[PDB]
Design an enzyme around this catalytic site. Sequence first.
Site, PDB file in Angstrom:
ATOM      1  N   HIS A  24      28.007  41.614  48.617  1.00 17.79           N
ATOM      2  CA  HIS A  24      29.184  42.892  49.308  1.00 17.79           C
ATOM      3  C   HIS A  24      27.621  43.773  48.742  1.00 17.79           C
ATOM      4  O   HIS A  24      28.061  44.129  49.347  1.00 17.79           O
ATOM      5  CB  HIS A  24      30.392  42.703  49.633  1.00 17.79           C
ATOM      6  CG  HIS A  24      30.552  43.120  48.070  1.00 17.79           C
ATOM      7  ND1 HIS A  24      30.671  44.906  47.787  1.00 17.79           N
ATOM      8  CD2 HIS A  24      31.785  42.765  47.741  1.00 17.79           C
ATOM      9  CE1 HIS A  24      31.295  44.814  46.660  1.00 17.79           C
ATOM     10  NE2 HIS A  24      32.212  43.518  47.180  1.00 17.79           N
TER      11      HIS A  24
ATOM     12  N   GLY B 203      33.138  50.451  41.915  1.00 12.47           N
ATOM     13  CA  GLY B 203      32.592  50.191  41.197  1.00 12.47           C
ATOM     14  C   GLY B 203      32.420  49.515  40.176  1.00 12.47           C
ATOM     15  O   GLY B 203      31.571  48.824  39.983  1.00 12.47           O
TER      16      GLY B 203
ATOM     17  N   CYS C 217      33.422  46.126  41.096  1.00 13.48           N
ATOM     18  CA  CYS C 217      32.882  45.724  41.907  1.00 13.48           C
ATOM     19  C   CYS C 217      32.018  44.087  41.000  1.00 13.48           C
ATOM     20  O   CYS C 217      31.212  45.524  40.467  1.00 13.48           O
ATOM     21  CB  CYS C 217      32.402  45.112  43.109  1.00 13.48           C
ATOM     22  SG  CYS C 217      33.536  45.694  44.416  1.00 13.48           S
TER      23      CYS C 217
END
Lengths: 300, 296
Positions: A41, A143, A145
């Site tokens: 993503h 942030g 991820c």
Amino acid sequence: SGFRKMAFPSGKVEGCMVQVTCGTTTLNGLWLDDVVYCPRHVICTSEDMLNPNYEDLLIRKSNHNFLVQAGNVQLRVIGHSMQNCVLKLKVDTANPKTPKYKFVRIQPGQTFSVLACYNGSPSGVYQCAMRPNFTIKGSFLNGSCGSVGFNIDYDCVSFCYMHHMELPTGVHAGTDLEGNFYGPFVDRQTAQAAGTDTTITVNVLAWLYAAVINGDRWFLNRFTTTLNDFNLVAMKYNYEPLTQDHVDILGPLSAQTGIAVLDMCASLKELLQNGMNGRTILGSALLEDEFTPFDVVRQC
Amino acid sequence: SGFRKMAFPSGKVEGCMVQVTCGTTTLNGLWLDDVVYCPRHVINYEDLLIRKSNHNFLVQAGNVQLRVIGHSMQNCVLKLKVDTANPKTPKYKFVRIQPGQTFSVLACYNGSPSGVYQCAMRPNFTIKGSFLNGSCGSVGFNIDYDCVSFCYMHHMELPTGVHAGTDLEGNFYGPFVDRQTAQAAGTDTTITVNVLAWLYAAVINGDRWFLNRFTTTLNDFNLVAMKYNYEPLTQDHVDILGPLSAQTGIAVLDMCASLKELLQNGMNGRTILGSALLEDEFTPFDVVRQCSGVTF
Ligand SMILES: C[C@](NC(=O)CN1CCN(C2CC2)C1=O)(C(=O)Nc1cncc2ccccc12)c1ccc(Cl)c(Cl)c1
């Protein structure tokens, strides 16, 4: 003596954390040999998060669109490919700090350490368990991820989780390092809800054995139970069914303490029925389910 | 979202852990520059140390043996001068912490790091750790930017299963000695400022059931705190909680009235951040750091 929620030393994983930037999105990547793994993503924009076609989006990207940063050094992307929900960025430098590692997919109830990162920089390490509903109750902000879950046995890092998203209840969903989501979750902004969570019964039993090993015995009783009668009771308190596999796994703890698994199962039934009555077990007023039988043996 | 007991990344400390063997005893050492720090009980300590020679100390950094070229004692810590400076030595300081302050512990056995956990220095100067035999010399630390502040070195387990140790200058935390004698931890108290910080973390995470319309004076709160074996809350503590008070809109004395109601009435089957007890091992700084994502 003592029983703490303990994480694995994070050093071997810290040396792998990098920052991946693609357009306006910045998240964390895992740099192992000459590949940086991160959630796919990172390629998504604003209007393509509800129904992203990742194959269509990735084909439009070039290597120079991905900015990878390892400390103050920028790495050069020389290839990109997608494996399920993980993006693999081939880089022109092998990470010299790459530890001995494996990619392992874990089962619900399994525990692991999470190295929470922001902008490719490690900020904290905590211990987690994969919930029976396939979510993890983590501590993550925007942030995070790309932050990874791992276990370290001997000198080998088994990477088992990569953080992808936060569900509306504040719980977290992610994939193994092959990009396969844990649970029925998808990397889409579509309406997704975690299923009703249940207590990891085998872990509670392991933790009751840890308490016995540490000298806590107040919750023990003279009763035993059949496995089926225990499961009929446990299910009414939203506890996971206890299988013969679980009974077998608890064997060493049963042998060490002299308390048969079905005998400890009867203590658990009683604790569920009565509550703790102002008492604690290993400093806790609730039954802890984020220590596996393997964690208890390792720590004790 | 989420609130976990979180330790600092241990990597900078892992690169310093070595195994120190002297006679039959094997424990952990902290290798910084050309000195290995470890508990002096690895060996009348001045009479015992004078009889030792450098070659009696076997220091092992991974599979490499380090050669001891000097030895000296500083309070309850032994300092073994080695021929090689640790190339992995991070930017570091030795700091002595106050009760209520938190730190991460890198638990080691045979110079090998096995686990990391976060804990608090109890008001009775013990730590509720998780240590087995061989963990002596395991260290407690905090990280500020890229600087490691070493604040604790494990020396022993007290009969109640709680732990005692020193700062890196060898000064014990608490009224303890490193000798086989009758030693007992004093009656412990709850770290009040930390419970308030954890209640603010619960509010930040959406757990608001315990909030009430009431406020209290600092003296009335402290009278109730004394009664429940809670540490006195000072004006310093109230000031430190200022940013959390400003972020959540709940004055510190307003959160104190919530705490007072919780102490006098209990949780009533309800939980806060997944806990049925009031957590006191998160400082106000820890809460800000975790609910803002500060990196190292
Ligand atoms: C990256 C993420 N984006 C957002 O949710 C950010 N956004 C989106 C909605 N909303 C708007 C600004 C007010 C936001 O805050 C995510 O969930 N990551 C985060 C990870 N861990 C913990 C989080 C804690 C607070 C926030 C975000 C968290 C995301 C969202 C949807 C999907 Cl389908 C996926 Cl795969 C990923």
